[PDB]
Amino acid sequence: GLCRADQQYECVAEIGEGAYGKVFKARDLKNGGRFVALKRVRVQTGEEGMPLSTIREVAVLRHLETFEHPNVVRLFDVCTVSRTDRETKLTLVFEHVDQDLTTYLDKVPEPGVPTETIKDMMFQLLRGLDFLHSHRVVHRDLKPQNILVTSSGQIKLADFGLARIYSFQMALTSVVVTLWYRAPEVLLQSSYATPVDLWSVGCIFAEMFRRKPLFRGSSDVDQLGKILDVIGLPGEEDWPRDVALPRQAFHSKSAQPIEKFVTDIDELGKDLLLKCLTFNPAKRISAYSALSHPYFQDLERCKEN
Template identity: 40%
Template sequence: PKFRHVHIPCVCLSLYLVMELMDANLCQVIQMELDHERLSYLLYQMLCGIKHLHAAGIIHRDLKPSNIVVKSDCTLKILDFGLARTAATGLLMTPYVVTRYYRAPEVILGMGYQANVDVWSVGCIMAEMVRGSVLFPGTDHIDQWNKVIEQLGTPSQEFLMKLNQSVRTYVENRPRYAGYSFEKLFPDVLFPADSEHNKLKASQARDLLSKMLVIDASKRISVDEALQHPYINVWYDPTEVEAPPPVITDKQLDEREHTVEEWKELIYKEVLDWEERTKNGVIRGQPASIAQVQQ
């Protein structure tokens, strides 16, 4: 990765059940004054991770700052897959999944949803990193919807026609809001100074936010499109973005009932398999790096 030399101070040493010890979660990083390089690089890593999940048919469904951890060298990891589901799962896709502040409109309104439900969550996280506070701090799911439309505006009739009749009746009976422009929601003063080195600007960050925080999921930016956005693609590395997706041998595993002891055994076997595949620093089944080939 290109950004390993950049230092984010360690605010709090937290232990996480991951492959290595991380320094802080994103809740703590949000309180720091990040420049454009750090902000865009952290978002790039989030999007890379989500792309690989989606490539494997997995929707995270619970992306939030406390589920994202960072090392002092800007390495980022996504945690907590307790609510993740395969896109083709037979389980009911309940709306009570994503932590309320980061719930996409299609989840709040009980609509069907696809992989880009995670993109809305990333947009909420990015907004929080820019503002230093939660963008849509709803007290319940109704108040959450109100917070969204108060700021982004009441959606079009085209979107409302996608709702089931009872939900549409409720939404149509709410006061109509014009919403605010993204220049008003995210004025230049909230952003760091424009970057001279990578030519990153507040206008680019705001444009990315405006494409992720779209109420109608069919018009929301995809993960692939976000990775190509000018605010993100300065870090684009094909070996990272286009790496093979994780292998899932049994996509129906989480749909079957297991005892705690059976889950322990499955996890133990998975760890042993991973250790075997990564002996000598090489992940078997994946292409070797250029450095390893040269050796």
């Protein structure tokens, strides 16, 4: 192709696989032996001999990386390892952090995550997300497994930016898709934009206090029903036009007081929580407005001792 990535990175373990290729944990032999994540991305080439839009998405990731936002994982390099008339093979080399939010939440002692740390971690998550949304990138699959947490408690968003494409049911491997953090407009197969990620933030916010997912459905319709049991049946004017599932198919249910499901959250947190878990995407808060909410008022950023 054009670069020999195999001489700089040593694969150590296979950690994943998407529609574009496998993902490896690897060692960066030029930079101390630190771990990185190697994502193989095969880029389709078309009649005209040019890489198709996947190359443009990789361009967007390189663009984003020139800002070096602290709350997204670093893109250290893009290597083209092979070029033929049908495909380019790229290896994307990302910073790898050896802890996700799932594991942090699982190992923390009783009685759970300190209040102030929940606040600091939600502030970093929203800062990362506002950075992506302000460059028109929607994450679309935010969940505790691709929120990485450094040993000093810094949050980094990972696993975003490549278009959703068909792949042979995942190469036939890895088959159980989690719908627990998906937004109602996506479960309804309606049109979606950036508000889909604030729904997921709302679910993760709740989970930081609960240490158990808020809405555990097992299909699109069951996931919706578990949602509406808590927040109540939306008005007819909040139910999207032209979708297959009618408001009628669900219970009439009022909202429940959220403290039945989330204990220990203060009154400012409750307000922000409900503003992320707003059914109609047009009424849901934005990430930039969430950063202004009074909940973040006392952000106690490193005192003495």
